[model samples]
Target: MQERILFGTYTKKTSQGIYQGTLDTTAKTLTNDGLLAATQNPTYLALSAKDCLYSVDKEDDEGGIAAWQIDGQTAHKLNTVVAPGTPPAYVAVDEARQLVYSANYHKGTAEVMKIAADGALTLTDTVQHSGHGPRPEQDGSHIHYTDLTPDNRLAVIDLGSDKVYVYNVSDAGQLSEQSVLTMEAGFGPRHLVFSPDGQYAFLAGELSSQIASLKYDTQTGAFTQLGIVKTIPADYTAHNGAAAIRLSHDGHFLYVSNRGYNTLAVFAVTADGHLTLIQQISTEGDFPRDFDLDPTEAFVVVVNQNTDNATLYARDLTSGKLSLLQKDVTVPEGVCVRFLE
Candidate 1:
């Protein structure tokens, strides 16, 4: 088996970029790194079914989606496809790998695009969001991220308007709005991930630093909001932001990244789809933009963006707790972590 690691950062005074590294999973270290500079504020990325890599470039101008070929341990730029709108923040591919979808943060729309067999992208359809809240930042509608339901329907969260929009996504990747679920006016839902059992969906609120629990009904492509909980302490009031949320590989726990507070909110998942806060871990740096647990459920890494570091934490799989392993390995403005094997 072969393993390749991919990461993105905002090293420039203005724009961020991405890099690819080959990992010796056996040795648990990184090597053979190849850097892709000037990517215009690259943020989130995903590995295609063909073993290629794609990233969402977040800059308003010169911001779109770019493709790269994963050869050995490095990602070589294959080509870039300008998305249908501006400020693509996240990218998600279907199980079939024939289509790609993105959330255009500033454009207030969700874009459905076709991913060619060779890994190039083509715009297919777009969905414009309507409705607004009272807050200044929520005056407009913006789709911050998109994910596929276990059955492959399109599920999106609107940060600007505080709503979760569900759509019946066609085989060709076209979207037809199915239902919209509303949250508190300024919850600012950012990203979501389904529980491994496919029974629940967790969304992280960017502006409020809270997470909303949705009981997932995969059979109907719908979700019912269970509750909203904050990531920060009740007594603390700072300018912290919650960025991403995900479930453990085994679905026993969930995690949310608190940026300004530089912490990870860990929760134990109950059988009835409830969350019980288990631990709050200091990520050991500033602005943890994203993080993930390794496939083995043994290691968790937090990408500290503002401080240019990726802090590793050892996971106690039995108890679902994390112990800080290495706090200071530098990786430029780190954002995402994925294991390739």
Candidate 2:
């Protein structure tokens, strides 16, 4: 039996806005099984508590959070709630399925919303960030992504402020500030992924080609900075930036998607919280914004935003390297891929 996977496309022009497919893990193929069109640009996706799909539109005016129901192999649009801020790009679902969190890129703030049992949504609370970056384009604070630890606490990534804020997620679906972890200004932390074991976290920076490894405390909801590492080779002088970061099922290998270099930086994780370069594999496409690994860790799907293709790569268990298997599943400016199964 095949599993279902969903891709959210941030397109320039296309009616088939989002792409849904089935992953035959045995065959290692991503076949187009469904598609849904959105009213605005859909940049990121998150799976809700009830297995429904949610996406945030990153446009200034029509941008908000939209909900969709994933039934077997198809994603059906459910409803959308207009939020308080502009250009909301990322989303996270609470464990209780009663609340969803989002980062408003333009407003430099984050919002929490209560989700109804039927998949409808209503904005409940908001938090504004405090700092900003130096670049003209990044002069204002921009909140990028939000994630909950394995123990179900919230962590918010503020790219413009260069901070990762942690919160205690209450049973009532509310957020209480815990501790704030700060990064160097202008680094522009974008997306984050926790280690499968939940002891560490990796932040993929946007403005610079660096990855920040953090030690996370589950009991106290605190984060400790391990150090900083570059995603690109030391020899490469090209303008490079990273987007998504993921770890292997066993937490032995790490992958970071490089946009300018159009490559995947693979690293080997050691027990002492250090990452060594394993391999640097080309994505075989332009501007890979996001990618996802299957549950078995046997396959990975890369979404090339500029090339508009979703490529499949087979993972070699022995060497911890990836070899391209398929690269022709067309998606319009594909940004994020969320595996449903």
Candidate 3:
């Protein structure tokens, strides 16, 4: 049986929008199936259990979130709602709550909407953020990513404010602020993922190029920083930026993507919920903005934005290492990859 995967691109000179492909689990290869949906700047995507794909339109003036119904491997747009904030960059869906969330990057706001039975989106609430970091990129509030915790709490990362805001999501898709986890002055938190057991949370710092491990208490909605480790090697310093972070299914290892260095930093998760650097391997392409491990955990697929391609790699479960595979597919300005089992 073949597994279908979706690739979201920036829709630049070569990309049309979203592309679908087949993943050969045994061979650890990817075969691009051509365009899945054509839209402007569909850079991020979130898949729902009801065969719906939520996407963010990364536009400055008319940024919005769109919903597409997936029929087999093809997707058709259902509806689009202009985001309360502009340039929405990240999206996530709460299947049980029947809600979709978008983190607007340029406007520094997080929006929640109700998902209709037919896969249409209706805006519900918009929460605006304020403050700036020390870097020039932090001139204003920039909400870079938003995701749900294992316990169904919403987590939004604001890069410009150097904070991770947690909220309690009501069944009606309404969000109420719960707590805020502040980062260092210059550590621009970009993305985050929770451990399988919901005991730990790992966040990637874009400006500092580091990964911070934290102890998470789902009961209290508290996030306590455990350790901060560099994604890049200490000796070699370049203009590297940490882009994505993901933990293995069993919570034994973590992986982070570096853009400027064009590598994936692999780390071993300690028993005490800390990280130990394992290896930093080249992505074989440039600017790997995002990547994901297949459901089977047999392969790792990376979307290299600058190189306009997606590279495949075989994962060694025992050693937690990655080996570049011969197979690669073209995805212009590719930034996000999601798997559909």
Q: Best by TM-score, which number?
A: 3
Better of 2 and 3 by lDDT: 3
The deviation in Å at residue 91 for candidate 1 is: 0.6
Task: For model 1, give the 10-residue run with minimal summed lDDT.
Answer: 23-32
Query: TM-score of every model?
Result: 0.91, 0.92, 0.97
Mind giving the per-residue lDDT tens digits that candidate 3 earns over 6-45? 9888876788888888888766578888899988888899
Which candidate has the highest lDDT of all? 3
- In candidate 3, the residue pairs with backbone N, CA or C atoms under 3 Å apart (3 or more residues apart, or in different chains) clash, namely none
The TM-score that candidate 1 achieves is: 0.91
Stretches of model 2 off by over 4 angstroms after superposition: 58-60
User: Per-residue lDDT of 171-267 in model 1, one digit per residue for the tens?
Assistant: 7768997778889888888888888778888888888888888898866777898987878898779888898787887788989999888899999
lDDT per residue (tens digit) for residues 1-341 in model 2 = 58777788766666356777777877768876657545467788888757777787644555688888867655677788775446587887875647889888888877887878778778777787777877555777788887777788788888887888898766555678998888887888888888878899888888888888889988878888897888987898987779888888788888999998999899888875688887888887899999978867788888888887888898987567899889878777788888875
What stretches of model 1 exceed 4 Å from their correct place? 1-3, 14-16, 21-38, 58-60, 83-85
Order of the predicted models by lDDT, top scorer first: 3, 2, 1
Full-model lDDT, candidate 3: 0.88
